[PDB]
Each structure stands twice: as C-alpha cells, then as structure tokens.
Amino acid sequence: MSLPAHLQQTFSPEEIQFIVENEPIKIFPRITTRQKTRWQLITTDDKALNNMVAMRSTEVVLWIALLLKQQSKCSIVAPQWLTTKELDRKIQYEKTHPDRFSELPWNWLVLARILFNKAKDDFHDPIHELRGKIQDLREIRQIKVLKGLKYLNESHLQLDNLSLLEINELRPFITEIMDKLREIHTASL
Amino acid sequence: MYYGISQFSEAYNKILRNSSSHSSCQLVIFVSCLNIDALCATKMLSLLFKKQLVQSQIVPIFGYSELRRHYSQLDDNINSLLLVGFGGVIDLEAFLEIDPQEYVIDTDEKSGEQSFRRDIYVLDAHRPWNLDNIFGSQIIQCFDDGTVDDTLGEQKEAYYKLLELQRKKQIHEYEGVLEEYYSQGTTVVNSISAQIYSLLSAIGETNLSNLWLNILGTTSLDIAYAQVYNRLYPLLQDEVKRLTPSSRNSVKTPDTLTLNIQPDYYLFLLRHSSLYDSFYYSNYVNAKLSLWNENGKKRLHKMFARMGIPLSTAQETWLYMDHSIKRELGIIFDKNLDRYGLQDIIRDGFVRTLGYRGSISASEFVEALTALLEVGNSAQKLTNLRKRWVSNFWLSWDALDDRKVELLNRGIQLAQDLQRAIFNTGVAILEKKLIKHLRIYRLCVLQDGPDLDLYRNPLTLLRLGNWLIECCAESEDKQLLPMVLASIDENTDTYLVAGLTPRYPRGLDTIHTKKPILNNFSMAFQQITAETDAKVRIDNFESSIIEIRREDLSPFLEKLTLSGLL
Amino acid sequence: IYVSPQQDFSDLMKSWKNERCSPELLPYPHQLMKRLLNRISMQSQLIENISMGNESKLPLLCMETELERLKFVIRSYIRCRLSKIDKFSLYLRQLNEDENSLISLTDLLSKDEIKYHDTHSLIWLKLVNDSILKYMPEELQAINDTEGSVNMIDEPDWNKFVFIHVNGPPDPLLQENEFGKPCYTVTIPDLKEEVELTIGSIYVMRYEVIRDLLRDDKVALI
Amino acid sequence: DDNTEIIKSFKNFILEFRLDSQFIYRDQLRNNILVKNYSLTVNMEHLIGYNEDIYKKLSDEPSDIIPLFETAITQVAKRISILSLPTFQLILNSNANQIPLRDLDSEHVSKIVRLSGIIISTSVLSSRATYLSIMCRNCRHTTSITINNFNSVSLPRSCLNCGPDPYIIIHESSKFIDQQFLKLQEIPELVPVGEMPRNLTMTCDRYLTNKVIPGTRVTIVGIYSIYNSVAIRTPYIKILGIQSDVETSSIWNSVTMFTEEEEEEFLQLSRNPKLYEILTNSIAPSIFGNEDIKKAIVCLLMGGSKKILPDGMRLRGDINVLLLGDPGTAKSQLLKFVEKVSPIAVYTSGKGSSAAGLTASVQRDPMTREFYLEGGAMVLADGGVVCIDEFDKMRDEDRVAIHEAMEQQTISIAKAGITTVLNSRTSVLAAANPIYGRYDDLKSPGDNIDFQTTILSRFDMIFIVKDDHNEERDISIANHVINIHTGQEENGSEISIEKMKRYITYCRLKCAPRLSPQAAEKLSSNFVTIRKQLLINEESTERSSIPITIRQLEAIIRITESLAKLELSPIAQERHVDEAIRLFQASTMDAASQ
C-alpha cells in the first residue's frame, strides 16, 4: 500500500542514520560568521551558527557540521568517548561484567561509522586502532546478546544500555518470538 | 586569446565567477573519448569542481562531427565550455559557425571590450596552434604552455600585419611566412594533466590523488612521445619527493598509501603475469630478439638459462614466484641483460601501493585503462560503434577509482588478451612479408586476418602499428620511413588507414634523436581528399587516421606515392 | 501550546517514531501539523525571495537541505498513517457506526485522511460487489460480519510487543524503588504480574500496559 | 619459543587483516562458529599481501607450520565466541600454476602443490586419533596425548619396573575425527604420449570428507608427502582444499546449494520468453542443422518427473534417445557434447564394453579374501546420462544386461553370496549404424535394423537419420565447416557450457511439473490415433519392427513434463503437449512409417 513491507514495524538503517544526524556535535569553525547572509533555520537553532568565530568551540547539528566539513570550513571535534583509552576502559568494563552492557552512547555505532567515513583527519588517534577497538566491543556485545536471547518469555524483557542500531537489528526476531509465545500462553488459558 | 602558464589561476577564478550558481548548472566539459591523458585531466577537473560545489556536465566525444552536433544541441545557460583534449589545430570559430556578434551581451565604448554569454576553453597538447584561435578570436580561450611566447613572436607579427592590411609584396611575404608556419606536421608537446596539476599547485589543491592522476597522464605518452616524458620526469620525481612523508619506519597499516620511485622495467605487466610472459609480450624485447620466429624463442630460453632462473620458475606467476629470485632480479638483470642487448629494460618508474593490497606501477595502470577503453564491454553501424566506444569511456573512468578494483583487474585481463591477439596478428604480418617497401614510405594492408574485428577501434590499430614500428623497423639500421597501416571490416566494407611517424632507436640520446619527427600525413591526406573524389572521412580528432572506401584505396595510395609530401 | 519551531520539530519526530512503532492508529496532532505546514510554506517563500535576489551560498544550501529533511519526515509520517488507515478501514467504520463510543474519526483523523478513508472504502466495496459479493445469498452479502465463523473486522493487536525507553515527566504515578532510583509500576492482567520500569532503561513491554504512559509521554517507542 | 611467535603472528594476521572496512577473516570465523562449522578458509594472496615472511615460513615447512596456524585459529575462535570447541581446520586457496600430475617427483617432496585430476575411487570413512587417554598396565599411571594429523607419534616406549610398551589406550575417554582416502587420476588430455593414466593416493580430514564423488574433475591443494609402508617411500597427497565444478552436496542430498544471486539469475533466465530456442542453439554450436535432435537432447538433459504410487509402483522419469544413421551424421560429436555438458555423464563405447563393465562387478579383495561389488558406467553415471557410442557393435550378451537398468532403473546382483539391488537412475543416449552401414531404401526397414523390438521399445525417441545429397544443403554445410576450420555470440542467443550445466542442475532439483486434464485428453486422443495408424500401416509380409506400446505414451508424457520443467512451470499445458507430439512424430513415427 502506501508504505512498503520492509519499512513496516521497523526502521531501515538509513532512517536510523537520519535520526542520529539530528543530535548536536562540537566543531571548530574555520570562518568568522559573527559580526562585530544570516542563517534562518526552522528545525534547529540558528543562534550558534551566526555567532561562530574562528578556532572557537561551538555546537551545531551533526548534518550541518558534515555539510560545513565538506567545504573544509570546520573541523569536527570527535566525541570524548571515541578515544583509545575510553574504548579500552569500556572493553574492560564489558569483560569484567558478563551480565550487563557498558554505558556507551545510544548512537555509538552509527556516529563512529559516520565520523570514520567523513572525518578521518580530525581524530587524534590512529583510525585503525579505533576500528579494532570498535570491532572488539561489537563482538563482545554480540556474545552478550546471544547469551541473553535465551530468556525470551511471554512477559516483559529488559535490555539496558543496548544501542539503537542493535535494537533495530534485533527488533523483528525478538518481537515475533515474544508475540508467538504470548499468543500460545493466551490460548492456553 | 590565450592564457600563459601563470594565468591558469585567473582562468579558474573566471570559471568560478561565471559558471557557479546552485540554482542551475552552467558548465559543460567536452572530452576526447579515446585519450587517456584527457581522461585523467577531466578526472582532476571533476574532482576540483566537486570540491567547490560546481554543477557540471561531462560529455564524451568522438570526432569533430559529434562535437558540432553536441555544440549545436547546447543550451543557452552554458556560460563556459571546456574542450579537453582537442580543438587546438582546427578553427573553432569557423568550424562551429560561431559569430561573435550573436554571442555578445554588453559592449562598453570606454573599455573597448565586449562581454559574451558563452566562453570556450581549449586544453590541447597538439601543435601547431591555429593562429585564428590564439591571436584573432576573443571567444576562444586557449590554455597555452608558453609556446606562443617562446617561439611564435614572428608568426604573431606576421598575422597581425596581415590583419592590419607596393603593398602586394609585403602581403606576399607575410602570407608566405604564415603558409610556411602552417606547412609543418603535428605532434604532442606536453601533457594536459601536467597543466592541470600546475593550475592546482597555483591554487594549492595538490594532493596524492592529483599527483597519481598527473603521473598516469604523463606516462600515457611514454610509449609514443618519449621526449615529452623525459622532459617531464624530473618534475614528477621532485613532486613525489615533496608529497611523500619523511619517515617510513612505521609498519604497514590497512589504510597506508605508498607512492615510491622504484626501478621499473620495459616489460608487459610484470607484476600481474609471469616473468616469461613479461619478456615474451614486450615490444622492446621482441624487437631486440625477434620473438616472432623460433630463433627468438631459442634466444630467450638461452637467456633465461644463463640468468639461472629455471623455466618452471620463470613461468610461475609473480605473486607465487620464489622470493629469492624475485629479490635478486635487479642484480640478475644488471649482469645479464647487457649480453643480449636488453640494457634499456632498466628504468625508474612510479609504483603505488595500498595497505594489504598488491602494488601496481604507472605503466601497468595505463595499460589496464587503455585495454578497458579498447575492448571494454552503413551510418547506423558506425554510430552504434562510436556509441559503444563512448560507453567504454565510462568503464575507463570508473577504473580510476580506488573502490572499483574489480574493474582494474578485468582491464588487466583484457590487456593481456589484447596483447596476445596483437602479437598473433604481428606474427602473421611479418611471416607473410606483407609490409611492402616503397621509397617514400612503407605500406601494410590487412585483408583476411583472423581478428580483423578488433582493429576497427583506432586505439587497437595504433597499438599494432607501434608493435610493428618497434619490431624490425626501429632496428635493422634501416632509414626511418613513415608507415601506413590499413584494416578492413566486412560489416561496412571500408578501410581504416592510419599514418604513423617513425621512431628513433629507444634510449639513444643524440642530437638528431633530440630533434623530434613531425607527422606530415594529415596534410597529405587532406590535400589528396580535396583533389580526389573518394568520399573519405577526416572526422577523427587524430587527423592521421581516416576511413577509406574499399575501391578507392589503390588510387589513394597511387596519389600518395606520387605526391611526395610525406 | 506553541513554544518554538525546535519544539515543534521534536514533537513531530516523536510522533513519527511512535506511529511507525505503534500497533494502533494514534490521534492526529492537528495544531502541530497545521503550524508545520504553514512554516514550510513561509520558509519556502523566504528561500525563493533570497534566491531571486558568494558568502551567502552556504546558508542557502543549509536552508534547502533542512526543508528537504522536514518534507521527508512529514511525508513518511503521513504515508504510514495512510497505510494504517488502509489496514483498519472496517474497524474505523465500526467505530463511527457506534454512538456510545467516545472516539470520533473527526478527532482521530484529519480531513484528508477522512476523505481518503471514505473514497478507498467506496472503491473497494464497489470492486468486491461487482466481482464476488453479488452472487452470495443475502446472509453472506455483508463485507463486515462479526457473527460468522471468522470475524471479518481486523482490529489492532493490542498486546503487541514493542521497545520502549522510559524518560519520566518532561508525577503521581512515579515512585521510587529499593535501589533509590525513580520507577514506574504497571500490571499485566493476564499474568497477574507487576513490572517495575526504571527511568532511563530500555524494556520490551506489551503495548496495552504502556499505552497510558506513552500517551502521557512518559515513555517513547524506540 | 619460535612456535609462540609464529602463533602470535598468525593471530595478528587473523585479527588485523582488512581490505576496506570489514575484517574478512574475523567475521568469517564468527559466522562459521555460529553454524557449528569449525574451520576457516584463507586465501593465500591475502596472506602474501599482509606479510611475505609469514607466507615464506608457511611454504618452507608446511607440515610443521600449519598446526601452529590451526592452534592460532582455535585461540582466536575461543576469544571471539566465548565470554570468559575442538581444534579448527585450515583450508587453503591459491592461484599458483597447476603442476601436471605426472610432473610430481622428488623435487616436490614436502611442498604445497596445486593439481587437477579425476576422482576414480573413494574409501569408507575411518577414525583417526586426536586426544588419546592412556594408562600403564603395572602402576596404572594416567596420561594423555595430543596428536596432529600432519606426518613428518606413538605410545611411549618407557613408562612414567615396567616393561616395554606398557601403556594401553583407554577408549571411552578419547576423541577421534574422520578420515577418507581418494584415488586421483590425471586428465586424459594431459597424459603424455603412449602412456597409461597415472593414479595418486590422497587423504582428507574432517570437513574435507564427503565432498567429491567418483568420476568428477576436481582441483586439489595439498602437501606432496611420503609414508613408509626399505630405501623407498610411497608418495601421497595430503589434501588441504578441494575445488570442483559440480555441486556434489546438492546432488546426493535433497538439499540444494545455490547463492541468492544465482537463484535470481536462473529465475531471470527462465523468465525469457524463448528460452527453448536459446538452449537448442546452445547445444553443439559447431554442428549444422540437426535441430530436432538438439531439441531431443535438451529434453533428455532436462528429463521428466518420477512418481511413486501409494501401492509402491514406481514410474520412470528418464528419457532415452537412439540415433540410427549413416556415417558422417555427427552423432558421435553430439554424444561427446552431451557427455561434456551434463552434470554427470560417462562416455562409453559399445565395442569396448562388457556386461560386468556397464552394471556392477563382483571383485575379491586380495587381502581379506572377501567379495565386494565395484560399479560400472551405469552406477558411476547414476543421476546423469550414459552415452553408449557404437551401440550396434555391442555383443548380445552385453546388450541384454541393459534392459532392467533402462526400464526399472535398478541393478540386481546374485553372485558369490551377494544379493542386492543397486540403484541406477540414468538416461541412455545411444548411437548406431544400420546393418549394411547405410539405410538402403530398397530393402525393408526390418532388414536395415538388427535390434530386437524389446530393446527398441525402451528408447523414448528413435531418430533414423539419412544423408540426402542436396546441393543447397551440401553447400551450406561445407561453408559452415570451412568457417569452423578457418576461424562468440553470447548476446542472449546462447549460454556457455557452465551456465547450462548449472541451470540443468537447478531445474532438475527444483521443478517436477504435472499434466493438466486437457493435456491428458489430448494425449489419449493422439495415442489412440497413433496406434490406429500403426495398425493400418501393417503389411501382411512383415510386422512393424519399430514398436508402439504403452512405453511410447509414457515417453511422450515424459517429454511434455520435461518441456514444462524447462521453464520452471509447475503445470504442463497443451502448448508443451503440441511440441512433445511434434517431436515424437518427427522421430519415432518418422522411423516407423518408413
């Protein structure tokens, strides 16, 4: 009908990316917009862009930041959590606690991919090390997800600190299996 | 008018000022469909315009007729037009029926200059420049490499005095000097990619990808015009030195990119085939050993035996060849190649590597691109063939990207197959002694070969012509003579005649070798066509390549022999 | 209560996500959508005015990209709503046919949705009447019979499992747990269970039990 | 010391390799572990690219380095799958030059080599030891041994007083793996001048077992080692990777192996409105004319559908074709092409055949003195096509052995105390000449055919090809042959051999159409008409040599079902019935009327 079948009940990865790019990010403007034309946006705030000074930290939307970066008019400041030391600490936390998930940002995977593809020279640390750390974190979380999938039941279920992309990936299977279990239990009564 | 070497930045700024508006596109680029140098130059320009967010259209073109058609089909919103790889020799104003009055926008009496809605930029390496485009016309802008100021002052004065005008004697002298200037042949003086890189350096947008494209464009000329490559090599060396990181101690990473000046060899696809194949399917090796008969094969086997490389090891592919022999190859060549006269195989080339991927040299990359251009995959059939070639242009364009490596591998395989086919055709030509020798020139006509279809493309015919020129002609101590190569297609019943300039022995620095040899066949062909009546086609950009009807070749060759203007 | 364009965009995104992940058809935000359409019209006029008249090139690109993003969001939301209306035409018609029901399609749908619903229902009814229904006896000539062997009216799956993220008030229902964190308590009548939802925690709950919290905006579907 | 460094290097290669943004081997290992596939396939080009020193070490001493690689793979798998599993197998892929099987000699001892051949025999799976639990007879000392299957190991000679060899293996606590033996012959085209084909012994372990069937060309990557059965060693090959052009897994199982990209290529091809013409043109492109025989060969390759009734009766679903014609008709070339294109096929000469050759043979084992059954062309070509050239040359005795195979699709053996019923579901394509070498129209058909009616009735379609001297056809054939001698459409008018073979396999494993009532009515009417015509055509002097029985009705049904299967159509309509009837009239009734 109006909506395709693959877009029903779930978001496509492009939709998840679109949702992610609405979040703020820190940049270093390479031009001086502030006065001592004017952005007039209706979805986000335009005060930050107008009051932008060279080599001064400012906050804008991620998609606007990428658009500026394409023109080489701003250097994206990578998130603090995307450092080698912080990723190592998160890996250690994951290893020490086999029952919970590390408190990573809900958009860590999507943001990491976007920044690796678009902003490669902005990172202070080598890109390959960050890729390896992210891969290891992903495998550990996959092991935890597989272990936790054994407790599906007709009642609720809790998955704390799980990111948005992982939830999007797992939504079909988990939802359908739990729905069928609930249907069987309801029929039993 | 023309722009000097330092005016490239001004021309680029003019293009930015005029043809830049996000509302609609106002920039169109016309590209020669069968020129690797033009392909690389247009790729560099496309990346540069993408950086600045300039809306543009890229249209491959084959021949002057298609240029006229496409220009007639152009819209009125095109402020600037780019002619990359052609247009230098012909009169664009006269050819394109461009009348400046119909193209003007505003005229200022005080300024003395007129503004025109459309502008045309010519990036042509061929010579001689057409003085109408350089000194007469204002709409046509030419990207000169300094030739006009270096050597065309006297012709400039003569043309200006002709325009400004007992006087009959002065007019006679000026028109005589103009005719003498116009009487010379055509050659290539510089690489367009070099000029684009000079522009980028002027505006400071030079990086490693641009340098790689410049290297490819420059080395595309090595096969034919080695003097240009030798002149431009030191600058490429210096630029590679400048752009390379000082420290290489860091271990390889998946994203590491290397660009080294390593010893290259005059061998065919050494790194993507076997050593035996590399020596076998090389123009220089075959020329210096005559590998088209059994004696050449015996000599090659004897050479390989004296180098200490087993025949089984030599035929092994490059990747899996024994590492000891691969490491010693440089020394082995240093001590053994001199005996068999292959001392020229030693050379320095550019090799590019990506992290955890194979390493490919510039010559091999150019060979793959040319193979993709050639075999990648009455008037109606001709149009369909030219459409197929235009389509192949885009496969070649895609191969230039680092993400599309499968296309590069396919091009390498097609290059191997094409070289094998050309070798077979050359063996057939030489065994049959089909190369007739007339005092003025040599002649070779293909009529009943096994692979006649492959030679409808001008590039494949030029490849075969180069193979034949290097073999048994560059050697033998025979006086240099231009060669005529013709092929036949039954599906259309017409010929593809291609004149080829002679070449001095490769790698023989001499005063006479320093001087170039011009290609005079365009003038003779045009004169014969105008005088005769045979419905010949001179629509190809390379004026030396024409299409001749089946019946008229014999009279055409008779007139060519009797003309004596070759 | 209008606040600012940013809040309107945030509410539009929340509504889009909830509609995409919700089993039922949620009420239409009439005022918010009217404001958004008017703002889009004014912004398009402003962009045209600026364009008609090089430092100003980047801002214009930003305006155009933002307009495209907002248009895409609204388009996806409306198309999802139309698909849901397609899947629940008979349900609704039954809602309207009942007078004791509190809900009315005028509040539950926009005018365009009402027109689309009526037109599609009429067209499909004409097709099925000219094809199949006219041959069956009078007893089987009703497209919506609830007394048959299988009910023909497809109601929403009330107990569908959905992902939620507890955010709390932008609270009488709020209470603290043993560990000192704010929490919500909901019941599952079928299983006679009590589930404690902790603020900031992701859960996979049944839609029916979380319906009130979702409507009050205390939780949001992921 | 050095072993630990080698293991660390292999682990780093596994955990660090990447060509764009996917860690190929890490993800591959995780995916393999997910489906309980404890192995890892490594492309040697990637290993060379990552670090040439590792490749040099691997090539220098494969038998000592590969186990370290397996240990590294196991450690990485444990890291990636278990949140704090037998030894994993390493399978190699390479593009190095293939060494002829006969060129393998002393110079290639203990080296990784690539070669191709034909599998002629496979053994029964055996059991090897990996983890052994042992105990001493006297002091009862418990000990364990870990064994790798790469041979340059034994029970300790001295206990840890106890006599020599004091340890006895405890079986219930040990772990074993699977092992198989294969015999690889050299390709017929690669054999030297005037030499018999050479055999080579090969071994495979764990996940490389049950991968090949006898009679299929394969490419093998392995180590050229030697084992002492006194100054000599018996050569053998330790298989490290098997690459074949036939999906053996999908042939012996109802399971079908085809990538999603394949499945969707074969659906698009089936959607072509004129696939029949493409396949007809794709068979024997170098042979002029013979369109009807090419269509018959297409039908034979596709085959019909087999039905098993509730009462147990089974109906044949294979199509047999006979070619009786004059010399120079290109029958043998068609047979060779059929053998080349079919997924499974055996080319045999009637002259050079026997009863025991073509069914199964009782063979006594030299050692055990026990009788076993080997297999012949109709067991080796099970599920395929048997091309019996020179059909006429075959002795009566030999010939008579084929009837049950053709009709009942089984082989019954009662010899040397062996009572069994083998399975031979094959299609027979035979070529033969008349009694006098040409079909003399002066003599009656009965005098031109020495075949008894019993054998002829089993052939679904019989083609009597007569060479007629027509100037136009002669000139056309001469031009075609001259062009062939002196001399690639691939524009949708023809598909290569590999694609056709894959499509044949897919169609056979996917579709089994059925006749519609209209098809049945039309077929019954045509059968009645044909039988009435045959009865009318009879002459008092002789009875029809070419028979028309219920088998011909079954053959026509099979042809219709094969035509329907050609397009992946679940149902066969009158459109296919018409083509089947036309083919039958063009071949069998054409032969009978004469």
Ligand SMILES: Nc1ncnc2c1ncn2[C@@H]1O[C@H](COP(=O)(O)OP(=O)(O)OP(=O)(O)O)[C@@H](O)[C@H]1O
């Ligand atoms: N129509 C044809 N097109 C191409 N080649 C043909 C054709 N007819 C015959 N030939 C050639 O004629 C030769 C006949 O040999 P072939 O073994 O194929 O004959 P045959 O029909 O099996 O006869 P025989 O009964 O004598 O064994 C082959 O080389 C075949 O290539």
Ligand SMILES: [Mg+2]
């Ligand atoms: Mg024969």
Ligand SMILES: [Zn+2]
């Ligand atoms: Zn003991």
